[PDB]
Amino acid sequence: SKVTTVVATPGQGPDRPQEVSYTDTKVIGNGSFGVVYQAKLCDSGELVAIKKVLQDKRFKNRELQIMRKLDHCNIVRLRYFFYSSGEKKDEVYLNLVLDYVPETVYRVARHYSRAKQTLPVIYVKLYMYQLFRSLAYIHSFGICHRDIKPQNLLLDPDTAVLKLCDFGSAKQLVRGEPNVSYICSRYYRAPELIFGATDYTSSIDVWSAGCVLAELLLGQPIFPGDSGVDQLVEIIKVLGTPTREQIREMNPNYTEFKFPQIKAHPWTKVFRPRTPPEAIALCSRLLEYTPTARLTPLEACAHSFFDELRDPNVKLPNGRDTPALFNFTTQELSSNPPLATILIPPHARI
Amino acid sequence: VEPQKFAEELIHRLEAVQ
Numbered sequence: 001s002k003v004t005t006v007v008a009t010p011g012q013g014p015d016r017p018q019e020v021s022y023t024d025t026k027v028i029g030n031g032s033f034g035v036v037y038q039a040k041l042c043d044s045g046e047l048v049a050i051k052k053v054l055q056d057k058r059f060k061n062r063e064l065q066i067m068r069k070l071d072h073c074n075i076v077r078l079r080y081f082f083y084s085s086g087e088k089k090d091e092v093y094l095n096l097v098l099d100y101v102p103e104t105v106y107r108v109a110r111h112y113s114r115a116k117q118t119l120p121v122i123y124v125k126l127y128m129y130q131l132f133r134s135l136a137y138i139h140s141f142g143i144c145h146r147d148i149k150p151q152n153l154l155l156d157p158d159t160a161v162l163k164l165c166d167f168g169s170a171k172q173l174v175r176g177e178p179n180v181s182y183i184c185s186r187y188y189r190a191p192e193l194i195f196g197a198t199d200y201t202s203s204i205d206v207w208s209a210g211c212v213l214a215e216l217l218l219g220q221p222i223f224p225g226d227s228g229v230d231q232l233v234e235i236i237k238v239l240g241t242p243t244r245e246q247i248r249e250m251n252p253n254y255t256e257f258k259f260p261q262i263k264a265h266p267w268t269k270v271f272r273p274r275t276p277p278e279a280i281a282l283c284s285r286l287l288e289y290t291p292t293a294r295l296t297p298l299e300a301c302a303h304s305f306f307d308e309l310r311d312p313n314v315k316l317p318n319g320r321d322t323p324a325l326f327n328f329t330t331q332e333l334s335s336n337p338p339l340a341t342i343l344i345p346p347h348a349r350i
Numbered sequence: 351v352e353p354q355k356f357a358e359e360l361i362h363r364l365e366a367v368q
C-alpha cells in the first residue's frame with residue numbers, strides 16, 4: 001500500500017502538532033456530512049477512523065471544539081486532527097482522527113431481530129449503563145449530544161465496551177437562550193422537540209436513551225413514524241394523552257387546545273411477559289412527558305436494573321471480565337456525589 | 351399559525367384512534 005504523512009494536532013494534548021503517518025486507507029462510511037476512512041497507524045499499528053468533513057474556515061467548527069474537551073472511556077476519543085483538501089478543490093477539509101470501533105449497538109440488535117431472537121438482558125444492562133455514564137459525563141460540561149440513537153453507539157464485541165460518537169449535532173446548552181428544535185433523529189425525538197419547544201434541556205438525551213432501552217427489549221423501535229405527528233400518536237398510544245401541565249412543561253403554546261383523551265397503555269402489556277420488572281421500572285422513569293420528571297443519567301446508573309453489574313461474580317457470556325464500570329471521577333460525580341455509595345461497590349473502592 | 355395547524359392534525363389523528 002501507500003503511506004500518507006501529515007502534521008496532525010493532538011486532540012486532548014496541549015496543542016503541539018506532530019508528524020503522523022498511516023496506511024491501509026479505505027472508505028468505511030459515506031454521508032451528506034462527508035466521508036469516513038479507516039486507517040492503520042505506521043507507529044503503533046493501531047486502527048483509527050478518519051472523519052473527513054468540509055469547513056467554511058471563516059468560523060470555528062463546533063464539533064471539534066466539543067471533542068477536544070472530552071476524555072472518557074465511553075466516548076470515542078479524538079486522537080488527532082488536521083486540515084487537507086479532497087473532492088471539490090479550493091476548499092479546506094477538517095480531518096478528525098478517532099478511535100476505531102468495529103460495531104454499533106444498532107447492527108448488533110439488528111442481528112437478533114432478523115434471527116428472531118431476543119438480545120440477552122445482560123447486554124441490555126451493559127450497553128444502557130455505559131450510555132448513561134457517557135451522558136452523565138458530557139452533561140457536567142453542559143454539553144447536549146442531541147442525536148442519541150443506536151447507530152451512534154459503537155461497540156467492541158470482544159470487550160463489550162460502548163463508545164458514544166457523532167457529536168455533529170451536539171451543542172453546549174446555555175440556559176435562557178434559543179435552540180434549534182428541528183434537531184435530533186426521528187424515533188428518538190423528545191416530545192418537547194416534536195412540539196417545537198426551543199427551551200429544551202439536556203433531558204432530551206434521556207428520552208432518547210429511553211427509546212433505545214425500549215427498542216432493545218422490544219426488538220423494534222417503540223415510536224415509529226415519518227412525521228412528528230406520527231411519532232406523537234405512537235407516544236400518546238403508550239403514555240396516554242399528556243395533561244395540561246405536562247403540555248406546559250414541554251411547550252406552553254399548546255396548553256389550551258383540548259386534545260382527545262386517550263387512556264395510557266400499561267407498561268407491562270407493552271413489552272414481552274419475559275421482561276424483568278426492573279427494566280420496565282427504569283423505562284417508565286425515563287420516558288416521561290415532563291423533562292424535569294425524567295431521571296438524570298447519573299441517577300439512571302444507580303437504578304436497581306443495573307444491580308447485576310455491581311455483583312462481584314458477574315461475567316461476560318464469552319468468559320471475559322466486565323469493563324471498567326466503577327471508575328467514576330469527581331467531575332463525573334459532580335451531579336450528585338452521594339450516589340457513589342451505590343454506584344461504586346465495596347469491592348471496587350477498597 | 352403553526353401550532354394551530356399542528357394541533358388540528360394531531361386532534362384529527364387522535365379522534366381516529368380513539
Ligand SMILES: CC(C)NC1=N/C(=C\c2ccc3c(c2)OCO3)C(=O)N1C
Pocket residue numbers: 028029030031033036049051076098099100101102154165166167168
Ligand atoms: C456510520 C458512519 C458512516 N457515520 C459516522 N461515523 C462517525 C465516527 C466513527 C467513529 C469510530 C468508527 C467509525 C466511525 O467507524 C468505525 O469506527 C461519525 O461521527 N459519523 C456521523
